Amino acid sequence: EDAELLVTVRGGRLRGIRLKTPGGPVSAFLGIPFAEPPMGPRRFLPPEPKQPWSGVVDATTFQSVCYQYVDTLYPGFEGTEMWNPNRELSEDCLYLNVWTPYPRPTSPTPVLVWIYGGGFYSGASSLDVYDGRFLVQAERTVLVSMNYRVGAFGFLALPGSREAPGNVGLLDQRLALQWVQENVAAFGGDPTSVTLFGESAGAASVGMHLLSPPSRGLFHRAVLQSGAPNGPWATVGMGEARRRATQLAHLVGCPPGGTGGNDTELVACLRTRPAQVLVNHEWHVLPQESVFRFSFVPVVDGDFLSDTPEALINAGDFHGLQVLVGVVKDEGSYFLVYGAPGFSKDNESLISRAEFLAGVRVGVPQVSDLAAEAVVLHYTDWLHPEDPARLREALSDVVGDHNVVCPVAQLAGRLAAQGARVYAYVFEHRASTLSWPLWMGVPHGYEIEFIFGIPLDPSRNYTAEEKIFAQRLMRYWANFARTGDPNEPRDPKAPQWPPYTAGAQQYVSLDLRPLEVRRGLRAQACAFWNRFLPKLLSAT
Template sequence: MHVYQILLSLSVIRYVVADNPTANVSSGTLVGRSVEFSHEDVDITRTLYVFKGIPYAAPPVGDLRFRPPQQVEPWEGVYNATEVGFACVQSISPLYSFGELLNEDCLYLNVFAPVTNSSNLPVMVWIHGGGLIVGSGTNGGLYDGTVLAAIGEVIVVSFNYRLGVFGFFATGDKHAPGNYGLLDQIAALKWVKENIAAFGGDANKVTIFGESAGSISVEHMLLSPMSEGLFHRAIMQSGTSSIFGGPRVDAEGQATLAYGIGNMLGCEQDNTEDLVRCLRTVPTEDFEPILNPEEGMLATIPGIDPDIGINPYAPYFDGQLITVVPSDLRNPGTLNKTGVDILIGANADEGTLLFPYVVPFQFNATEITLSRAVFEQYFSAFMFGSFKSNPTILDAIKLTYVPWEDADSDDANYAEAFSQMQGDHTFVCPSDLSARAYAQSGANVYVYHMTHIPATWLTGLPWTKAGHGEDLPFVFGLHFSPVYTWTMPAEEVAMSRNIIRYWTNFAKTGNPNLPESEANSSLADWPRFEVPGLEYKELSLTMENKRALKARECALWNDFIPKVENREDEETATEPNEGDNGKPPECTAGAIHAAGVTVYCICALLLLPSLLVMPASPEYIL
């Protein structure tokens, strides 16, 4: 029995009377804790009021499963907001096993508010990562907001949202439209807008920020008409909505997946209404085969590609919350929040995230060696998009990344080529696409690229270098954290303080630089990203400014490959089929978008969009 199998009769509302800070919110009175922050490596001592485990929506259980979040019922007395609430039910992963109890009743948030003379502090709302299948708002202290709030003098809010099958199950129609996890995020932002003044926050100065799947979520919030007016700035760390081809678009394929999942859970129905009604009665613990499948089990569900693994719980193009697909970012007028300031970037070695899938897991290695044979074997295995079978495009990718100066040598190491290829394809160049789109729409955009290789790695594996997620200890100031044990050398302590300043300055003003009245020569000015210009900040010990980040590589992924695909699609669409009197093939789905490019002719045997997701494992932290 897993920890999420908790009796729902356990009360999560605890009434207390204590000499601690209180706040009056829309549902009643909260009592939190007073925390004193200080650290020998920072010249700040500050009191914070911390409130944890605040319900921002009704428990999404029973008949509310697979429905949008509902309003919290008001409570009487004082609600004890001193402990985190349940984390959402999720796949079991060692990286996210921080002792937090799991439950479907999980829609809770946390507020870290510095005590100052100001009654209108900027607010930073954190959206956690984890591939939309694991994680929580605090992750056992990794995302504790104490340091950011104390050093940056901002209010930090973190929250849980529904994950996996509970957050993204969809039938492709009105009976289960999906995206409940994203709707939870919108509900949390509405709660902030309505209640943050009770903590000294300014509802008109809200910044959303997230990493990996949290950053993907941030861009969905940026592009969704449903989040209009709920935030004013956005920080995207290693993730965009175009990763893995973007949201699913195939309603028929989504229904096939839904029926397959229903069959696995004993809900064999012949229509989606009855299917969803049945699934709402399935006990939480019976979802175990879906949450933590045995090897190969998900491949038995109709609609799952056994070769690449398709995540059944991805965002779905519902036409209401999600109305934009990745290729739309290339079209002027797509963005509906041009007044939002943007800070966006990725890390220099994002592609090392995939090394455990192509080489034996090497805990003690300091460097990974990848032979040419292994490189060829896995060359396209972790790419999304129909171009995986296009020899012209694959040759162009090899031409760009293969170390040709050593390629003829039997002992040539292809590890860096593989890492950079995958990192650019999945993180760096999608971020470049978004940055250009926002800048050209008139938004205030700042771009970063973290190149510093930390002294200590979140994974504990030195060959990850400046890998996926390695910016998190610097952003959350783990070296200064009162709840998370982490030590940095002196030069990294300074780097972390600078990054905290950049992030919180941006939250305050829309500009990561210090105001002129607080100018600090040790903190180099961060230039605005413009097209042309293409200037960005390198997150390193020296914080240098550079330009044209991966311009050649991103021209390959963002321009050349889509053009080749579109050209071949157009040529195919004009070729007559034999026995069809010279007429082009008839299309039943019209012009839709799939796999990150426009596909103009989708016929009856439409495949599911290629959304590549690795198994839930210690190494996979999207």
């Protein structure tokens, strides 16, 4: 019996579990409810806080995954199954988890809140690659992670209506942040040192919380990994949201008979349908064939988001905030096997000039033919315009720059130029255990396992250099959480990680090699995406 594993919070008591790490034990509290189950009449509505409970809630295992699509493109393949749900699917899924060092810290400890990615259509906090036991044990911080609603259940929006207002998945995250405010002190946490961090759609969410006033007062630092709220895939307008919501209703038989019709009676019909029925038609509402586009994402409503994320980044003040931001080397490769012609996981994907011209249409959807011509102009190597290997890397960079790198570099510059101290990285190491083919390089999402210290797990087959690389990255992230500065405070013998400024544009390469300061985050390419291509679309 340990008094460490019995905690009282505002709602009741919890029984935790003690986990082993190669270098010490850690207390965990997996499956804590922070909201009433959004089932039946609550589907599509904002979350209500959990009513207090009598007795002791068992918090020894992860709760259910939120209802989501399950990838089946490559069954039995490690590269895809590692992101698929490892628990049962249920709309009863609003639960968070807390990791804490053993023994519990006696002084207030910085808290790290993780928001998982998954294109706003998938993801769970229970994935093996988000295990916070290694980061908590080694750097003696407090880690909190949550489940938020994804897909139609979290982002179906009929704007104006109040039966399905939209962005309820973002409200699921905000409620979990208020929970950390009201309750993290019971676990040894400091409600005055909260660092949000996420990846992909999690990094976009972290960014959208920077831009929503009610959420701004709930955290103090931010880490955005391979994502940004200004990405072309992260938001939609009220009109397109209404269209996608309406066609999803039609595909599942709503409304029955004539279309009418009240938004009230359309949502009423959607609430009667089984959850799996809505999931099976989620991809049929995309307007065109495209990679890196998702059906139900945050909407610009006027409530949670006052304006477009690009507008609020420009007309904002970010003094006193510190932000860590970065991308991986090959951001766009992972998405090319999901629709781009000529691409396969199981061959070299040496595409022809014709397939490259068609892939540009899938990688940059809804563009004038002239805008398509300009992309082909900037990314072709006109000395070898038909080298398939070079065409392969080009389309990967087209998707990577358009969706991740350049929206990130856009946001990074505007933050430093408006108060915030910003540090930037580029993750360049390819894990030895990576199951994707060699030509994909360092794909989207494969820095997470090093940040969470997964290579320290003895059951894994990582190399000794990567274990050292893991603790080094865990040091950086934890230092940023405590001090707002990833540099080791009491250490002038280590390479300095200089801030990212709008003029010098300095970043570092995270690798098995020591730090290496570079300049320009795809500077020449992103000037096309951020400066010229907007004007080329204002032609017509």
